[PDB]
């Protein structure tokens, strides 16, 4: 198994609106590659 972990403090209330959409993006340029997602799970709790 190989893993990588990164953390950062982000003050979300100061950066994003109260309501949001979540999503994936990918791009290619001159060099390129296929970018695919096989599964996606999500949970949040406000209050």
């Amino acid at each position: 198994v190989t893993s990588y972990t990164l953390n950062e403090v982000v003050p979300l209330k100061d950066v994003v609106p109260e309501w949001v959409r979540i999503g994936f993006s990918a791009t290619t340029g001159a060099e390129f590659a296929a970018q695919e997602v096989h599964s996606w799970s999500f949970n949040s709790q406000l209050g």
């Binding site: 198994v1 990164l6 949001v20 999503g23 990918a26 390129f32 997602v37 799970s41 999500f42």
Partner: protein, 181 residues
């Protein structure tokens, strides 16, 4: 109290609870954001708006997402530009492509963006990427220039499992990426 939760382990040709943009589409059980073609963008958003903080309480949400993705490039030295998980306003549209990854427009702090992204960035852009030139995980806040980066070795064609978690009490965003070998 609001909560929201969802799980997709196989994508339908007609995934009606996603919004596709650019080359985004579903084929074979999977969500394809780009194929291996030059100068293209794909995004896919979950269709429901999430309540992430409340102006009234000043509460902020805890959340966790996890997903599996694959990057499939023609070789180890022909790969660009990379892949994000992002959080953005409800009406978000694709932004500049290429090394701005469909999500941002400049390396300068742009408080109108109101976008947080976690990038898996496969291409050194000399103007903003870490100078060691390696591939890397970054936390991006209103800018393509990450606030924090971790060097990462792309395993081409392999499935990575990502979890991203946000602790509201702490305002810490954690990202872990795992490969099987």
């Amino acid at each position: 109290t609001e909560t929201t939760s969802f799980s997709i382990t196989k994508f339908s040709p007609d995934q009606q609870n996603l919004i596709f943009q650019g080359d985004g589409y579903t084929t074979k059980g999977k969500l394809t954001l780009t194929k291996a073609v030059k100068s293209t963008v794909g995004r896919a958003l979950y269709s429901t708006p999430i309540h992430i903080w409340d102006r009234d309480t000043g509460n902020v949400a805890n959340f966790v997402t996890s997903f599996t993705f694959v990057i499939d490039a023609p070789s180890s030295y022909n790969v660009a530009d990379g892949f994000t998980f992002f959080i953005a306003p409800v009406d978000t549209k694709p932004q500049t492509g290429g090394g701005y990854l469909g999500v941002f427009n400049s390396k300068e702090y742009d408080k109108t963006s109101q976008t947080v992204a976690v990038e898996f960035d496969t291409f050194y852009n000399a103007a903003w990427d870490p100078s060691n030139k390696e591939r890397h995980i970054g936390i991006d806040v209103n800018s393509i220039k990450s606030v924090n980066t971790k060097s990462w070795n792309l395993q081409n064609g392999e499935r990575a499992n990502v979890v991203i978690a946000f602790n509201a009490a702490t305002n810490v965003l954690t990202v872990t990426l795992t490969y099987p070998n």
